[PDB]
């Protein structure tokens, strides 16, 4: 089978997993201060750091690097939560264990731990994400479809919410063509994998919206000098 040029470009832009982990862990293992209660503070910084890696990834991305910062900010403003969710989901697909979840740090959490420690919103969101994990495993989601889905999500904003329409609209069209062409060539006996994958993105967006609600309900404070990128993303307006 042949692999769409856009996908091959995306595979060259994928960070090395252990380097991403080592960097995140190094930040997390710093002598900490005293304001929210464990384990939340640590996990929150972890998510923050994961998004930082994601931003770094987007800065190396073909069409993204071109755009004016105003637009870059707007794309990331629209997609940050979905990128994080997709990152988490894909981590679980590779991990392949129904009983626990794997975090970006290599740390592993029992679903039975979540059942007792987690509020109802958080608990129902984690379990809902495991369902999507099972679906995508059964669909044989691979690394090529993954990086392409990340790219699609990144550029998922209706271009009317942007200043420049041209470059982003084309990018959307190229990525959609690449995913279709790849699923047809590499998974001919699946039939509508292309559609089924785009349908997955609908559930990613739904999980992403519940994730923001959980965070909103934390009633987080603004920062003196801002320290947490995700906090900024969460409080950012339209």
């Amino acid at each position: 089978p042949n692999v769409p040029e856009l996908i091959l470009q995306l595979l060259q832009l994928e960070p090395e997993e252990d380097q991403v982990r080592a960097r995140i862990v190094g930040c997390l293992q710093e002598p900490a201060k005293s304001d929210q209660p464990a384990p939340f503070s640590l996990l929150c910084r972890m998510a923050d750091q994961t998004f930082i890696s994601i931003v770094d990834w987007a800065r190396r991305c073909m069409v993204f690097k071109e755009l004016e910062v105003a637009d870059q900010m707007t794309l990331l403003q629209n997609s940050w939560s979905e990128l994080l969710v997709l990152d988490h989901i894909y981590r679980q697909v590779q991990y392949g264990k129904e009983d626990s979840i794997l975090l970006v740090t290599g740390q592993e959490v029992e679903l039975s731990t979540v059942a007792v420690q987690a509020g109802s919103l958080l608990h129902s969101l984690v379990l809902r994400a495991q369902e999507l994990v099972l679906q995508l495993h059964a669909l044989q989601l691979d690394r090529q479809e993954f990086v392409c889905l990340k790219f699609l999500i990144l550029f998922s904003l209706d271009v009317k919410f942007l200043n420049n329409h041209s470059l982003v609209k084309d990018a959307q069209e190229k990525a959609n063509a690449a995913l279709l062409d790849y699923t047809l060539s590499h998974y001919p006996h699946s039939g509508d994998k292309f559609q089924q994958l785009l349908l997955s993105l609908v559930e990613v967006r739904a999980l992403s919206m519940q994730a923001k609600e959980y965070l909103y309900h934390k009633h987080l404070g603004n920062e003196m000098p801002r320290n947490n990128l995700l906090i900024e993303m969460l409080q950012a307006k339209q």
């Binding site: 931003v55 900010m73 801002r226 320290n227 990128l229 900024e232």
Partner: peptide
């Protein structure tokens, strides 16, 4: 006060 914008320009 834009951490995001700061990162994108670095």
């Amino acid at each position: 006060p834009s951490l995001l914008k700061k990162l994108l320009l670095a």
